[PDB]
Amino acid sequence: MDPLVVTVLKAINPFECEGRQEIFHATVATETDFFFVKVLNAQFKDKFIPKRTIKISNYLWHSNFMEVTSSSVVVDVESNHEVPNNVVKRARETPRISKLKIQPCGTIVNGLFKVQKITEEKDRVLYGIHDKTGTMEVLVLGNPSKTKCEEGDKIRLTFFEVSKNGVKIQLKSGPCSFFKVIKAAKPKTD
DNA sequence: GGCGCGCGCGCC
DNA sequence: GGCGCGCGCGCC
């Protein structure tokens, strides 16, 4: 609701997303917790640099994240706020699968995930991902992709959502998700 | 009392 | 940030 002073923890450079808005994603934190912010505005990037303190007014707050529009006001401010170490650590860490299983649809998920299997289709790709807590599926709609991922590689997800599909709970790409394939290193020939 | 879960922290 | 480990609380 009212203006909120937050400390910026992470922010990617803007990329073109879908109408056809240029946007970016950031992670910010108060003294108690962190949340991810989708900033529609793009102009706002110069204010979203890690460790800077910003005051944000006129924003939307949904079930999981915070939306910052061109109607919003982002003002750089000097603050004595300090983010506790573990709030930063949790803000930045990749959630476990067993933890993800019990989150509402629309919950924003970012992180780095080991993939065991890739079910390919010209309209979607399903990535079997795994950790020690379970297995899960990551649904990326509409690509070959150009990011060809083999087993043993990793996928870096930005702004995916927990999703229900009938029986199973997966991770779903949205229109403004970012997806990247992180390839396992090739042993070389001296 | 046992144990799982969330959380914190230290080592890599 | 990943990973492993201990602590405390709440449910059984």
Distance from residue A122 (CA) to nucleotide B6 (C1'), in Å?
A: 41
**CA distances for A16 relative to A20, A143, A175, angstroms:** 7, 16, 10
Q: What technique determined this structure?
A: X-ray
Q: CA-CA distance, A114 to A24, in Å (whole number)? A: 25
Q: How far apart are CA A37 and CA A27, in angstroms?
A: 6
Resolution of the entry in angstroms: 2.2
Domain chopping of chain A, boundaries: 1-93, 94-190
Q: Between vectors from CA A9 to CA A171 and to CA A78, what angle results, nearest 5°?
A: 145
The domain A94-190 is placed in CATH, from the list 2.40.50.140, 3.30.460.80, 3.30.230.10, 1.10.3710.10, at 2.40.50.140
d(CA A76, CA A147): 37
Matching fold, domains A1-93 and A94-190: yes
CB A116 within 8 A of CB A128: yes
Strand C neighbours among A 103-162, CB < 7 A: 111-112, 131-132
CA-CA distance, A177 to A45, in Å (whole number)?
18
* Residue A125: exposure state from Cβ atoms within 10 A (0-12, 13-18, ≥19): buried
> What fold characterizes domain A1-93?
OB fold (Dihydrolipoamide Acetyltransferase, E2P) (2.40.50)
Instruction: Give, in order, the Cα–Cα distances in Å from A47 to each of A43, A95, A105.
Output: 9, 27, 30
Separation of A103 CA and C10 C1' (Å): 21
Q: Is the CB of A90 under 7 A from strand C?
A: no
> In chain A, what is the greatest distance between 2 CA atoms, to the nearest angstrom?
60
